[PDB]
Write a protein that binds this DNA or RNA. Structure first.
Ligand SMILES: Nc1ncnc2c1ncn2[C@@H]1O[C@H](COS(=O)(=O)NC(=O)[C@@H](N)CO)[C@@H](O)[C@H]1O
Ligand SMILES: Nc1ncnc2c1ncn2[C@@H]1O[C@H](COS(=O)(=O)NC(=O)[C@@H](N)CO)[C@@H](O)[C@H]1O
Ligand SMILES: [Pt+2]
Ligand SMILES: [Pt+2]
Ligand SMILES: [Pt+2]
Ligand SMILES: [Pt+2]
Ligand SMILES: [Pt+2]
Ligand SMILES: [Pt+2]
Ligand SMILES: [Pt+2]
Ligand SMILES: [Pt+2]
Ligand SMILES: [Pt+2]
Ligand SMILES: [Pt+2]
Ligand SMILES: [Pt+2]
Ligand SMILES: [Pt+2]
Ligand SMILES: [Pt+2]
Ligand SMILES: [Pt+2]
Ligand SMILES: [Pt+2]
Ligand SMILES: [Pt+2]
Ligand SMILES: [Pt+2]
Ligand SMILES: [Pt+2]
Ligand SMILES: [Pt+2]
Ligand SMILES: [Pt+2]
Ligand SMILES: [Pt+2]
Ligand SMILES: [Pt+2]
Ligand SMILES: [Pt+2]
Ligand SMILES: [Pt+2]
Ligand SMILES: [Pt+2]
Ligand SMILES: [Pt+2]
Ligand SMILES: [Zn+2]
Ligand SMILES: [Zn+2]
Lengths: 527, 527
RNA sequence: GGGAGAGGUUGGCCGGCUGGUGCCGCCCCGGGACUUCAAAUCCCGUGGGAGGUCCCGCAAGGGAGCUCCGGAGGGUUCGAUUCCCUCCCUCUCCCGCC
RNA sequence: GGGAGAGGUUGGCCGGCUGGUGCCGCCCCGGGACUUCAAAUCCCGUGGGAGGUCCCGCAAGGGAGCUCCGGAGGGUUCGAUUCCCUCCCUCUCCCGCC
């Protein structure tokens, strides 16, 4: 892919000028610039920058400057500015007050067939033209900030990526085919065929909440949840010696950005905006509310105006605060490993659609284990964790498989292929549990993931600038257990009649709850 | 306050007309309308509507119609429309195609001195003029929807309220002076003077999280939190027989509206917007992200565009899902009372300011008790709950007071004075705990509220349309314990050295955690 | 089960009429006139539902008035109870099924 | 502690000069010329820091080149090492404090 730049540069002189007196100097400069300055740094076989033309108006000198990857037009402009202004200053007592790039054009010549639909959306350009297997990108009024931040450079990288069809996902990193079953519990005799959501709605173990994806869990359901969770903490989390933590469920949009998670699933998160400072805006709002007496376009639009820009996301990962914890810190193997868990609250995923599954919800509860160590140690914690969980699933008499996770959570986007970092051969494993009411065991939709076990390699260690004293390689990982999910699976397999639930569960129910609590019936509702 | 309406009404005839042929009919109608129709329903001593003038253009008949509270101009317009169109239809073969109110004016004559600053912001009017102790409100282009919804009526109510200076808060409902101490634990000998936030930051029992108002709680802190919470659940919640529930922490803006809570604290909540459906918007976004390589005005603004209108608030009350549960349901005393609690997760309050207190945070943990019963029973649950809590505070060897709560949470706004409903003499009580490091016990800022105990009267029962079979009066109430707060108070009083903590706490720490966990130190951080 | 026919109000699963904002008969209810009483006779209808507004009452509640409803929604028209379209529903017939 | 004075580089807490994009002397480093060797002598300076770009190398890393830095920030000017303002900091003096 040949790549060629052309810029319209404008040098604004300190005062008006009579060009005829100036040109002699510009001509001389330009000629010697093309010969020397704009060939400097260019490798022997290649082309640099040339000032292709110039002209002098009363305020300005206008230049056509062309470039190559070896020397780019604005870098050229930089080399020219300071110099041509010293000459102008010495010869004519005139400087260059400002320098601007009204038009900056880049042409990418392809061997591949290209058309608009191949390219797609091009983020920063004012024009995109595709012709003759060529992409002409034009940028108006280019800031020094764009240039410093290599914004155009990345646009180019993008357009290349978009044309080369790299977007087809077998192109992705994981070494082992997802779906691949590492481990299996053979089938248990099949004890319950009932539909957990429908049955739970029936008996009112959940009542549907007004918001999409959400539910109210009434006491029998909640008692199950409590002990199920407590039993998980006892058998796995606490047994493997993870120490407790309280992590924020409200996560700064910038933490999301550092993780690259924002790049990955921007459409699967909820966004959160806080209120503006000025208390009178809300005095006024309160007034609009009273007068309209409802939420409508007017009041709801007026609400938006009193809000700030979105600065947070309701936490989907559930492990984020941990990288903020280690951020910019330096570790010693005597301080390693670090193993924390958090069971504080609800974790959110926005899925659009019929939200009607109890097995897939927007608001869920999970135990998040999180850890950092040298990578041999790093991968063992995940192994132990898996073995730990397998044993629990057995104690809960559940049918389960462990398979290679289909996609990395923090990998769920692509062009991040831009960096370079050390990654595990198998980033993510899923602990799946069979739900009989969904179909025969062969069917992948009859299994839900009740937990994911991930080694991250160096990914977050890098973005959060976590280092080791020596400089040893550091790895992180997280595992988490959707307890909401484990509950559904327990019901799906063992059914709703409590005396047929697993032993450790009955005991927990009885001791803490004195029997399985009953639905808070009304006359109308439970039905 | 005398009140007088004048409307410019426009009746649009089905076809163009030659007025001279029409006027004879309009004149006749108008004269008889003023005599009969527009005096109907008006009480004997009072004024109705009059059509003060009319004129006929080629498409339209224009009318000046004036009114009083007894008969308002548009009601007049309604009485006129159907009738004048039957006559026009019979005499001229012409109907009234549409009817509009381009200008609708209301004048409120006051005896009180009024100026603009008294009135303040007037929500729906296109003009407000104050002169000669008079407020002229003008509405352009008035929809039938405004009229149906009595929007203007409430504007008037408002402007009256705003002038009558009712806004000064001694005007508020609570019978007993807030601050009033119902009950007290005499001073304990004073065992620790240290500053809990500063000390905790020092030893790294919390690390500061990037977002305003938030923190990471590391294992010793979290272990304390876990057992403290578990001990509360054992001694109060579970002892008084509250049954467990899982309540949504993400609350629909409409639930907020029904509670009247939105009217109350619109500036103390976080707002949440979900993403738009179209997945390509995010394809595009992902692209803008890569190219800019940062969150900035451009990308952050572009993010806003892919978001929907705010439809939720991060739950500040912590009891909201319960009214959604009972909503539109009918209860039987055999089903009463209903007592649930929820310990699911974080509850949010946006306070703007230096967020540096551990005693006042944006993201906190509390146990929420919630209940419904006949009101004698209703108030007992709160009493029991208080007695329950007092005993716990004693077992935790804390200095505590119970005082009349300064403001109702769901009362935190005003003009809701519009309705009529049965309210307790003392809506809210606070359980306050002494923090030595803040000042001498006399100082109210040295006490924080570790819980609030509220009977709501009929307030939510009404707005959520919860009824009883018989029709007996129903009450609700909630209590909640900020466990975050209880932790700070424990430290504030007993200090950071674990062997000097209360007995039931040590035991809980040892059994579950095998000693008090240690800080996950790095080389740099804990410091 | 498939098909065709008849119908559907605002006291009446009453009958009839009507492109003029609904009318006629009969009955029921309520009220009124006539009057020894009774019955007979005659007049009135703001007779059901739904939602606002205003007045009265501490309250339970009472009164005034207005708009909308003709199975439900939509069309035509100046005007639809009336004509046309869609669905709903009752009632009889044919066909097939035992 | 208060006050006043002197100063502050991009090899040198070296000295001097300079409104022309920095220069002079001396020393140090590196490189080069002259040459029996040594020393002497002469020339060169892209000699420190910071950040991009390009090339090379599997890599550790190597090379080319460009922009910015004269205590830190800002002003004037066509041009600031030089002049002016603000803060920082070193060095001496006076005053007061023992
Ligand atoms: N929508 C959902 N409904 C219920 N549980 C869910 C949902 N999304 C995630 N979970 C639970 O959370 C676990 C982790 O989700 S994950 O995307 O696969 N992996 C992660 O988030 C990792 N960061 C570990 O927390 C799942 O295995 C499941 O147990
Ligand atoms: N910003 C905060 N930081 C810490 N705890 C808080 C905060 N806001 C509220 N709480 C806790 O939550 C309790 C209840 O808050 S409240 O406004 O007073 N009352 C309510 O919210 C009631 N609906 C009961 O939940 C407080 O007493 C305190 O224990
Ligand atoms: Pt090339
Ligand atoms: Pt020159
Ligand atoms: Pt071009
Ligand atoms: Pt520039
Ligand atoms: Pt560039
Ligand atoms: Pt640049
Ligand atoms: Pt891809
Ligand atoms: Pt079943
Ligand atoms: Pt309201
Ligand atoms: Pt390794
Ligand atoms: Pt238990
Ligand atoms: Pt009922
Ligand atoms: Pt009046
Ligand atoms: Pt007429
Ligand atoms: Pt007026
Ligand atoms: Pt209208
Ligand atoms: Pt009105
Ligand atoms: Pt209306
Ligand atoms: Pt008020
Ligand atoms: Pt102290
Ligand atoms: Pt990126
Ligand atoms: Pt009562
Ligand atoms: Pt325990
Ligand atoms: Pt260190
Ligand atoms: Pt009205
Ligand atoms: Pt460059
Ligand atoms: Zn995670
Ligand atoms: Zn509450």
């Amino acid at each position: 892919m040949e790549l060629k730049f052309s810029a319209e540069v404008e040098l604004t002189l300190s005062r008006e000028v009579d060009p005829a007196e100036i040109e002699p100097t510009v001509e001389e400069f330009v000629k010697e610039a093309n010969e020397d300055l704009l060939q400097r740094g260019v490798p022997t076989g290649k082309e640099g920058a040339k000032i292709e033309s110039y002209y002098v108006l009363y305020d300005t000198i206008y230049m056509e400057i062309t470039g190559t990857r070896y020397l780019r037009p604005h870098e050229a402009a930089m080399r020219v500015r300071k110099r041509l202004a010293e000459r102008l200053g010495r010869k004519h007592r005139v400087g260059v007050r400002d320098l601007k790039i009204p038009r900056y054009e880049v042409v990418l010549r392809f061997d591949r067939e290209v058309t608009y639909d191949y390219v797609g959306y091009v983020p920063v350009a004012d024009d995109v033209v595709v012709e003759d297997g060529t992409v002409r990108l034009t940028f108006q009024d280019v800031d020094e900030e764009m240039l410093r931040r290599h914004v155009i450079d990345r646009v180019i990288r993008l357009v290349a990526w978009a044309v080369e069809e790299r977007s087809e996902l077998v192109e992705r990193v994981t070494k082992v085919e997802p779906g691949t079953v590492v481990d299996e519990s053979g089938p248990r005799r099949i004890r319950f065929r009932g539909d957990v959501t429908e049955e739970a709605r029936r008996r009112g173990w959940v009542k549907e909440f007004p918001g999409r994806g959400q539910w109210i869990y009434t006491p029998p359901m909640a008692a199950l949840f409590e002990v199920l969770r407590d039993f998980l903490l006892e058998r796995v989390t606490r047994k493997l010696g993870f120490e407790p933590a309280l992590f924020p469920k409200l996560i700064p949009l910038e933490t999301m950005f550092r993780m690259r998670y924002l790049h990955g699933l921007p459409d699967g998160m909820y966004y959160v905006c806080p209120p503006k400072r000025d208390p009178e805006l809300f005095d006024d709002f309160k007034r609009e509310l009273y007068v309209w007496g409802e939420l409508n376009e007017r009041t709801l639009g007026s609400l938006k105006e009193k809000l700030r820009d979105p600065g947070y996301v309701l936490a989907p990962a559930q492990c984020e605060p941990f990288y903020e914890l280690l951020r910019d810190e330096v570790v010693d193997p005597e301080r390693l490993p670090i193993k924390l868990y958090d069971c504080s609250g609800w974790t959110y995923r926005w899925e659009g659609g019929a939200a009607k599954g109890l097995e897939r919800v927007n608001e869920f509860q999970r135990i998040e284990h999180v850890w950092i160590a040298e990578p041999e140690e790093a991968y063992r914690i995940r192994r132990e964790l898996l073995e730990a969980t397998k044993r629990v699933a057995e104690e809960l008499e559940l049918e389960w498989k462990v398979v290679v996770s289909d996609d990395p959570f923090y990998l769920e986007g692509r062009l991040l292929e831009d960096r370079d970092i050390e990654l595990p051969d198998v980033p993510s494993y899923e602990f799946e549990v069979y739900l009989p009411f969904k179909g025969e065991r062969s069917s992948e939709e009859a299994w839900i993931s009740v937990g994911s076990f991930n080694v991250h390699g160096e990914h977050f260690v890098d973005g959060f600038n976590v280092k080791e004293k020596s400089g040893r390689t550091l790895f992180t990982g997280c595992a988490g257990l959707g307890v909401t999910r484990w509950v559904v699976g327990l019901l799906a397999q063992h059914g709703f009649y409590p005396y047929e639930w697993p032993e450790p569960i009955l005991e927990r129910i009885d001791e803490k709850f004195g029997g399985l609590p009953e639905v808070p019936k009304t006359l109308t509702w439970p039905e």
